[PDB]
Write a protein that binds this ligand. Structure first.
Ligand SMILES: Cc1cc2nc3c(=O)[nH]c(=O)nc-3n(C[C@H](O)[C@H](O)[C@H](O)COP(=O)(O)OP(=O)(O)OC[C@H]3O[C@@H](n4cnc5c(N)ncnc54)[C@H](O)[C@@H]3O)c2cc1C
Ligand SMILES: Cc1cc2nc3c(=O)[nH]c(=O)nc-3n(C[C@H](O)[C@H](O)[C@H](O)COP(=O)(O)OP(=O)(O)OC[C@H]3O[C@@H](n4cnc5c(N)ncnc54)[C@H](O)[C@@H]3O)c2cc1C
Ligand SMILES: Cc1cc2nc3c(=O)[nH]c(=O)nc-3n(C[C@H](O)[C@H](O)[C@H](O)COP(=O)(O)OP(=O)(O)OC[C@H]3O[C@@H](n4cnc5c(N)ncnc54)[C@H](O)[C@@H]3O)c2cc1C
Ligand SMILES: Cc1ncc(C[n+]2csc(CCOP(=O)(O)OP(=O)(O)O)c2C)c(N)n1
Ligand SMILES: Cc1ncc(C[n+]2csc(CCOP(=O)(O)OP(=O)(O)O)c2C)c(N)n1
Ligand SMILES: Cc1ncc(C[n+]2csc(CCOP(=O)(O)OP(=O)(O)O)c2C)c(N)n1
Ligand SMILES: [Cl-]
Ligand SMILES: [Cl-]
Ligand SMILES: [Cl-]
Ligand SMILES: [Mg+2]
Ligand SMILES: [Mg+2]
Ligand SMILES: [Mg+2]
Lengths: 587, 587, 587
C-alpha cells in the first residue's frame, strides 16, 4: 500500500510497544501529528509547555516502566532543548526514544539555511544517534532505536528525520520490521560462582547485601526477601534500589550514600563482606566521589562494563539479579557451614538493629517541633500518614533532596524518582507528571525546592488539562539553599544564591490547580487532606530553613568532594611564551 | 603573584571588555562566583530562573551591542540547557562567550561519574569550542573565545573548564594576555568595483538598495541616507537591517520577505538591479526558501563565505558596508550618466511611492478591526503613539510575528529583536530582558504569543528584582495559532495546536509585575499608559483571533515552502531485504 | 616512588598482559621508547616501515590471540596513518590498544601549531577514544582501554597522551591499577531455551549447524565435534569460524558465503532449520548483501546487539557458544524423539555428502592443468602438500580471495587471516607478519594479489630483520583483476585497473629475502620447497589470469550487490531553485 512517511513512523512506534507520546507541533511535525490523529496512539498525546519539560515527562514515565513506553516527537528546533533530559537518560539508564523532524533535506548543508538542526550535537549523549537519509529507512531506523534504548545498559536513542520524508509516499511492503525479537534476560551465573558467593556469605561475620536499581529492573523483590531472611543478612540499597526490600523490615538498613540513611552508612562501614546486586557503584551513589572504601565484595550485574571499572571485586559475575539470588537460595542448604536459623537469632542481628534504631531515633528528632519554619522531615512524616505502598515520592535537587530520601520509607520498587544520575535542577515537577501518566493508580507526592520549581512549573497547564493530581510541596527558603550554606562555609559569603518567590498559591490558582500556604497556619496535615480531596494537581507552599538537608545533616557520608581544595601548580618550563607576552619583551 | 584560576578567569573577562555577567550557581561555579564578587562585575550579575532563559538574555544584550558585552558563566549540568540559544547566536551572527565550569578533571572519563558534561555536544554549534586541560591555558582560551566571537562572522564561543582548575593557584606572570587589538574593519573595495557598481546603479531603470544587518554592524546609516537621496533609489531592508534607513522616509519600502512589508516585496519584484549591502540572503530572509528570483545584483559583504554560495552576483565585493557607500558617493559625480536631481523628481520615484502608499493603506485597514478579538496591527498603532526613536520592539515566533514586523516603523538600527536566524519559540521575553539590561533608559515593547510566553515567563523573577520595565503584550488565542490555521488548510483538521492559558493577569500580580487585560474594554492605549506609569515590568493581555497574522495576511511572499507537497518515491531495486523480512519468505 | 609518565605507561602495558609492542620513533615517543628499553617488553619491539603497516601487524597478532597481546605506540603524526587498520579491528572484533603520543599540551589549541593531532578523528572508529589531560590519569586511561578492547564485542581502543606528560614525573603510589578483575565468560543459557533448540533439531528433516568466529573465541571445537556427531548434523562455518570443525570430516560442508564453498551454500539453501552459534550474520558474510534467505533459526551469541538486528530468529539466546553446546549435549538424550544412531546412518547424511562430493570434484577440476598461467586452486593444492594443521593461511582482497578460501582446508581455529570485516586492500602481508610473530611454531602461507602486495611490501625489512619466514605467493596479472573483470561486464570496458609490476624476484633479493619466479618454469612445488628450506621470508612470483576467482567462479552465491543498478529518481517539487539558477532566469 502507498503510505506517507508520517504514517510509517506512527506504525513503527506502535509496532515496538509505544503507549505514550509526548509531542510538540510545528510545520516539520505537521504530517506526523496528522498521522497520529488517525491512530490508536493519538488518543494519549501530551503537548507540553516546552520540549525540555516534555522530555523530563518521558524520563519519569520510562523510569518507572523500565522500557521506552513513552516517546518524544519534536518539530526541528525544539529538539535543541532536549540535551539535559537526554543526558540523565543516558547515565541514569532510562530507555527513551526521541524522534526529531528536521527541516527539508533539500536545504540541508546550505550555509544560510534556517532551522537545520545540528543532530550531531546528540552524538556524545544518546546511546544511538541516527540521521535518516531515505524514506525506505524510516522503519529500520526506528526498529534500531528501540533495540538500543531497551538494552543493557538502557538509555536514550535519537532519530533525526528530514520532514520532506514524512510527506513523501512509498509502497509499504515489508518496510516496517514486524515481530521484533528478544532473548530472555534471565542470565544464569556459573555454578562455581554461586558456590563462591555462598561460601563468602557463610564465612563472613557481619555481611551485607547491597541491592541497586538492577534488582528493580530484574523484578527481584521476592527472591531478595527470601534470601535475606534465609541467611539473616542486613540489606542496604542504592537510591534507585530503595523499595526492593520492605523498608519497615528488621533487616532493612535503608540506602547508603551521602543523601541516604545513617543506618546504611554505619552498616557499610562495619561490614566484612558485601554481596552487590544490580548496582553500578556510582560517583553520587555508593562511591561518594570515589572516596568510599568497599569491604571485600562479590559484584553481580548484567552489564560487564560496570564490573571492575573502579572498585575491583573479589569476584565479578555476569548474571540477572533475580536469577542469581534464586541460584544462591538453592545452593545454600548444602554449603559447608550453613545452618537454618531464624534471622532474629543470628549473631549479627543485634548490631544491625542497633544501627537502624539509632537512625530512626534521629529521624524522629527531626520530625519534632511544629510551627515555622517547618522541618522537611516533619513534612514527610505527614505524607507518610496518607501514603500507600503504591504511591510515588519525587524530589528535585538541593538541600531538600536529603530529607526527601530520609523520610521516604518504601515497600515496592521504582517509587522514588529524580534526576538520579546527573542531578539536573528542575527535573522534579515534570518527572512527577510523567510518573503520574504511567501510574494512574498511584498518588504522586513531589517535594521540590523553590529554585527547582521555577524551571518547569509552566507544565501546570498539562497537569490541569490532563487531570494529573500530583501533590506538590514547594519548600520555600528564597534561596538555592544548598549553595547558600556551602558557599557561606567555603568563603564566608554566599553569592548568586538568593532570589524572590512569587505568591505560589496565586500561581497555582491562576492555572486552576489547588493552592494553599502553611506560612501562617503550619497546617501541613490539613493542607495535604484538602489537596487530596480536591482531585486537582496541588501546590502547598511550606516555608523551610536555608540550611536543613544535604549541606548540613549528618548521615555518615564521606563525600562527594563538593568543597574541593585547590593545589598550587608549577608554571611551565622551557622558553615558550604566553600569547601577547611579545609586547612585554619589547614591541 | 600567585592567583586562583577563578580570579584569572575574571581578570581575562574584564580585559576583553565584559560589561554584564549572566551566571548560575552550583558547586562547580562557586569559585568563579566568589571571584566575581571581588570585581565591579559582581554588583549586577543576573541569576536567571533557568540557564536557557539566561542564554537568551545574553543574546538580546549582545544583539543590540554588536559585541560580546554580556557573558554566560554556568555550573556544569546547566550548560546542557544552552544549545537552543547558542544555535541562534551562530546563524544569527550574535557575538557571545559562554564559560562552562565542568566537574573535577580527576573524575572525567570514569564511566559512572556524575555531572561530567559532554562539551563535545557544542562542537557543531559554537563557532569555537575549547576544553581547557591546564590552568596555565585559562587566559589564552578566553582570549581565543573573544577573538572568534567578535570576528566576521560573529557568533558564540564556548569554553569548558574543569572546576578544579578554578580552585587551583599558579604564578600569574603574563598568563592573561593583555593589550589585544584588532585590525581595522573599514575594508575598502577596489576602485574598479566601486565604478562598476556606480555604472549599474545609474543605468538601471528601477534599481533598489537592499541593506541588511551588516549595515547596522558597520554603522552605515548616515552614508546610506546620503547615497539613497543622491541617486534617488528606494531602500529595502532585511529584518535585521530595518531601521538603518528611517522608515518614515519617502524612499523607504520596508523589509522584504515573508513577514515583511508588501511595498518591499513589490519593489523587489519590479527591480531591474539590486545593490546588496551587508545581507547574507538567507532562507527565512531574502531567499524565502530559495524561491526568490533575484534581479542582477552587486553583493558587498565582509564575510567571503556568504558571497556566491547560492545566488550568483553580477559582481561580488569583499568590503565594509559604510566604507563602500562612502566610496560610491565619491565616484558618482564622475560617473557618466549621473546627474544631481532631487529624488522626488526622478522617473522611478512615483512607482516606489505607489507601492508604499498601497502598503500603508492596507496596514491602516488592519488597524480598524476594532472588536474583541482585537487586531495586533491596532496594538502596534497604539505602541507607535508612545514610541521614541531609541525604543526597542521585540517579538516571538508565530502568527503574531507578521503584525509585529509590519507595525514596527523604525528610525535607528538594532531596534527589532527576535530569534531571527532560527525562529526558536520562547525567545522573546528573555531577549527583551537582555535588551533592557543593555539599554537601561530605552523603553522595550514585546509582542508575544501565548504559546511563546509559556516558555520563559519564569524570568519575571529577574524582571521584578532588577526592575526591568519591559512592556509585554500577550496576544491570547488559546493556541499555536499559526499551526492551527495552517494545519486546517493542509489536512482539513488541526492537531496538537490548542491549550489552556492561565489567568495571565493573575500570574503577573503573583510576581509583583503590573497586569491588565483589555478583554472587556479594548483599551490598549490606557493599558500602555498605566503600564508605563507603574515603573514595573508589565503584562497586558490582548485577546486575538487564531488566524490573524502569518497564516492569513498576504504580504507578497513567495515562500518558504513549509507546507511542502510530498513526492512518490520508488522502492529500492536489487535483492536486498528489509530487516525482519526474512520471516516473510518462510513457508 | 617518583616516576616519569613514560615509565608509568610501560608499567601499565605490562600489568594488563601486553606481549608484543609495535612502535614508531619520533620526539614525542622518545621518552616512551627510552622507558621500553629498560623493561621486559623492550626485548620484543617491532619498528615497522610505516605506522599503517605496523597497525596491520597488531591486527594479525591479536586476531589469532583473541586478546590485546600486541599494542601500538606511536609518535604524534604517525597516528594519522592508523584509521584503516583501526576500522577493521572495530567491525572485525579484533582487540587492539593503541597509544598515541601527541605534541605538547601547552601548545594544543593554538591555531598555527604543528603536529597537534586531531584525536577526535578516531571517535567514530575506536570502541574507546580517550584524550588524557593529566599525568595522574595515565594508568587509569590504559586500564580502561584494555577493558573496552577485550570485551564483547572486542575492538580497538585509542589513548591520546600529550608527550609532556611522558617526561613529567609524579609519585607513583597506587597510580597504575593493579590486579584488574574479570568475570567468567562461560555464560549459560536458560534451560527452557536449550530444550527448545533440542526440540527444533529433532523435529528438523535436514538441519544445519552454522558455526562462526565466536565458536573460535569460545574455544568450542571439542564440543562442536561431539554435538555434530551426536545429532548427525552437517556443519557450515563463516570465514572466521572455518577450522573449528575439521574440514576433512564427512559432515564438513565448509564456509557459506560469496567466497565460500558451494557445498555450504547448497546445504544452507536446502536446510529447514539452522542452529547459529557465534556469528553476526554479516553483510559480506552469511547475509551476502542482505539478500540471503535464512531458514527458521535459533541464534546464540554473547553480544545481544547482533541478535535480531536484521535476521529475526525463531529463538534468540545470550550464551557462550561452547557452554551452550555442552548444555545441549546434556539435554538431548531425554529429549522426545531423540535416538542415538551413528551419523552415517541418519536419513539426512546422503544429501550432505553428495553436496560435499560435488564441490570437491569441482575443486579438483580447478586444480587440473599445470603450466601458465597457473590456477590459484592448483597453487593451494601445492601448499596443502606441505601444510600442517597448525599452519596459517593468509589472503588479501581481490579475485584471489575466492581460491584462497576455497583451497584452504583447515583443522584448527584462527588459521585463516585477512581484513575480514572491511576488505581493506594491502592487509595481507603485514597481517601475515603479525600472525607469524604471534605463532612462531606455525608456517604462514600468504596468497596475495599484485595490487595488494604493492601496499606494504616495504615491511620486508621487518620480515628479514626479525626472521619471520612467511611464504608469500604473489599472484601476478598486472591488474586489479576483480575490477577488470567486473567493469568489463558492467560497462564493456575496464578503467583504472591495469598497472605494471616490478621484477618481484629482484625486489625480494634486494631485501635479502628468498625470491623465485615460476613464470618460465611452472615449478610451484619446487619453489615452495626451496622457499621453506631457505629459512627466510620468501616471495614466489606466480602468473595467473585476470579473471579467475571472486568475480567469476560459481560457488552458489547470491550477493553482495557489487554491480548495483541505478534507479531513475524524480526531481524535487516546489519552487526552490539550485545554486546559481538565478542567472538562468535573468541576472
Ligand atoms: C543530589 C543527589 C543525591 C544522591 N544521593 C544518593 C545516595 O545517598 N545514595 C545512592 O545510592 N544514590 C544517590 N544518588 C543517586 C546516584 O547518583 C545514582 O543515580 C545511583 O546511586 C545509581 O544506582 P545504582 O548503582 O543502583 O545503578 P542504576 O543507575 O540504578 O543502574 C542499574 C544497575 O543495575 C544493572 N542492572 C540492570 N538490570 C539488571 C538485572 N536484570 N540484573 C542485574 N543487574 C542489572 C545495570 O547494569 C546497572 O549497573 C543521588 C543523586 C543525586 C542527584
Ligand atoms: C518567523 C520569522 C520571519 C522572518 N521574516 C523575515 C522577513 O520577512 N524578512 C527578512 O529579511 N528576514 C526575516 N526573518 C529573519 C531571517 O531569518 C534572517 O535572520 C535575516 O533575514 C538575516 O538578515 P541579513 O541577511 O541582513 O543577515 P544577518 O544575519 O543580519 O547577518 C549580517 C550580514 O552582514 C554581513 N556584515 C556584518 N558586518 C558587515 C560590515 N561591516 N560590512 C558589510 N557586511 C557586513 C555579515 O557577514 C552577514 O552577511 C524572519 C525570521 C523568522 C524567525
Ligand atoms: C572479499 C571478502 C570475502 C568474504 N567472503 C566471505 C564468505 O564467503 N563467507 C563468510 O562467512 N565471510 C566472508 N567474508 C568475511 C565477512 O565479511 C565477515 O568478516 C565474517 O563473515 C564474519 O564472521 P562471523 O559472523 O562468524 O562473526 P565475527 O566477525 O567472527 O564475530 C564473532 C561473532 O561471535 C560472537 N562471539 C564472540 N565470542 C563468543 C562466544 N564466546 N560465544 C558466542 N558468541 C561469541 C560475537 O559477538 C560475534 O557475533 C569475506 C570478507 C571479504 C573481505
Ligand atoms: C540545571 C542546574 N543548574 C544548577 C544546578 C546547581 N544546584 C544544585 S542544588 C541547587 C539548589 C536548588 O535550589 P532549591 O531547589 O531551592 O533547593 P534547596 O537547596 O533550597 O533545598 C543548585 C542551584 C544544577 N544541579 N542543575
Ligand atoms: C522551540 C520551538 N518549538 C516549536 C516551534 C514551532 N512553532 C512555530 S510558531 C508556533 C506557534 C507559537 O504560538 P504562539 O506564541 O501562541 O503564537 P501564534 O501563532 O498564536 O501567534 C510554533 C509552535 C518553534 N519554532 N520553536
Ligand atoms: C584500500 C582499498 N582500495 C581499493 C579497494 C578495492 N579493491 C578490492 S579488490 C581490488 C583488486 C586488488 O587487486 P589484486 O590484489 O591484484 O587482486 P586480484 O583482483 O588481481 O586478484 C581492489 C582494487 C579496497 N578494497 N581497498
Ligand atoms: Cl517554526
Ligand atoms: Cl549540583
Ligand atoms: Cl617529527
Ligand atoms: Mg530553595
Ligand atoms: Mg497563540
Ligand atoms: Mg592482480
Amino acid at each position: 500500500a502507498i503510505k506517507r512517511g508520517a504514517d510509517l513512523i506512527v506504525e513503527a512506534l506502535e509496532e515496538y510497544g509505544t503507549e505514550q507520546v509526548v509531542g510538540f507541533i510545528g510545520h516539520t511535525s505537521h504530517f506526523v501529528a496528522d498521522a497520529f490523529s488517525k491512530s490508536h496512539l493519538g488518543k494519549r498525546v501530551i503537548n507540553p509547555a516546552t520540549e525540555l519539560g516534555g522530555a523530563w515527562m518521558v524520563n519519569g514515565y520510562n523510569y518507572v516502566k523500565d522500557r521506552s513506553a513513552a516517546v518524544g516527537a519534536w518539530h526541528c528546533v525544539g529538539n535543541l532543548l532536549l540535551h539535559a533530559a537526554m543526558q540523565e537518560a543516558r547515565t541514569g539508564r532510562i530507555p527513551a526514544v526521541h524522534i526529531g523532524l528536521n527541516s527539508d533535506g533539500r536545504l540541508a548543508g546550505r550555509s544560510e539555511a534556517a532551522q537545520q538542526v545540528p543532530w550531531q550535537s546528540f552524538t556524545p549523549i544518546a546511546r544511538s544517534t541516527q540521521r535518516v537519509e531515505r524514506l525506505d529507512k524510516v522503519g529500520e531506523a526506528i526498529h534500531e532505536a528501540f533495540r538500543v534504548a531497551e538494552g543493557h545498559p538502557a538509555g536514550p536513542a535519537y532519530v533525526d528525520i528530514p520532514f520532506d520524508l514524512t510527506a513523501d509516499q512509498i509502497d509499504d511492503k515489508a518496510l516496517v520490521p514486524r515481530g521484533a525479537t528478544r532473548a530472555k534476560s534471565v542470565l544464569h551465573a556459573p555454578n562455581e560462582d554461586v558456590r563462591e558467593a555462598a561460601a563468602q556469605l557463610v564465612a563472613a561475620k557481619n555481611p551485607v547485601i547491597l541491592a541497586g536499581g538492577g534488582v528493580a529492573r530484574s523484578g527481584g523483590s521476592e527472591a531478595l526477601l527470601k534470601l535475606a531472611e534465609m541467611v539473616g543478612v542486613p540489606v542496604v540499597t542504592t537510591s534507585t534500589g530503595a523499595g526492593v526490600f520492605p523498608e519497615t523490615h528488621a533487616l532493612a538498613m535503608g540506602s547508603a550514600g551521602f543523601c541516604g540513611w545513617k543506618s546504611a552508612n554505619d552498616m557499610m562501614a562495619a561490614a566484612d563482606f558485601v554481596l552487590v546486586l544490580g548496582s553500578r557503584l556510582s560517583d553520587w551513589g555508593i562511591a561518594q566521589g570515589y572516596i568510599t572504601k568497599m569491604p571485600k565484595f562479590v559484584h553481580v550485574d548484567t552489564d560487564p562494563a560496570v564490573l571492575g571499572t573502579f572498585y575491583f571485586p573479589l569476584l565479578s559475575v555476569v548474571a540477572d539479579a533475580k536469577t542469581f539470588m534464586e541460584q544462591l537460595i538453592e545452593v545454600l542448604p548444602g554449603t559447608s557451614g550453613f545452618k537454618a536459623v531464624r534471622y532474629q537469632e543470628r549473631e549479627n542481628f543485634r548490631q544491625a538493629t542497633e544501627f537502624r534504631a539509632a537512625w530512626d531515633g534521629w529521624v524522629r528528632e527531626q520530625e519534632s517541633g511544629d510551627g515555622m519554619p517547618a522541618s522537611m522531615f516533619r513534612a514527610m512524616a505527614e505524607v507518610r500518614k496518607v501514603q500507600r505502598p503504591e504511591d510515588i515520592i519525587v524530589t528535585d535537587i538541593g538541600n531538600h533532596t536529603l530529607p526527601m530520601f530520609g523520610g521516604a520509607i518504601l515497600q515496592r520498587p521504582r517509587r522514588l524518582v529524580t534526576s538520579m544520575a546527573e542531578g539536573i535542577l528542575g527535573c522534579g515537577f515534570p518527572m512527577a507528571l510523567g510518573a503520574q501518566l504511567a501510574e494512574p493508580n498511584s498518588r504522586v507526592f513531589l517535594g521540590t525546592g523553590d529554585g527547582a520549581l521555577y524551571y518547569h512549573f509552566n507544565e501546570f497547564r498539562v497537569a490541569v488539562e490532563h487531570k494529573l493530581p500530583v501533590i506538590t510541596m514547594v519548600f520555600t527558603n528564597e534561596s538555592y539553599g544548598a549553595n547558600w550554606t556551602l558557599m557561606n562555609h567555603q568563603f564566608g559569603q554566599n553569592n548568586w544564591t538568593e532570589f524572590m518567590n512569587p505568591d505560589w498559591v496565586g500561581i497555582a490558582k491562576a492555572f486552576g490547580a489547588y493552592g494553599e500556604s502553611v506560612r501562617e497556619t503550619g497546617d501541613i496535615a490539613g493542607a495535604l487532606q484538602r489537596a487530596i480531596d480536591s482531585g486537582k494537581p496541588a501546590l502547598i507552599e511550606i516555608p523551610v530553613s536555608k540550611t536543613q538537608g544535604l549541606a548540613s545533616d549528618p548521615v555518615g557520608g564521606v563525600g562527594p568532594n563538593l568543597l574541593l581544595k585547590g593545589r598550587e601548580i608549577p608554571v611551565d618550563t622551557g622558553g615558550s611564551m604566553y600569547p601577547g607576552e611579545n609586547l612585554l619583551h619589547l614591541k
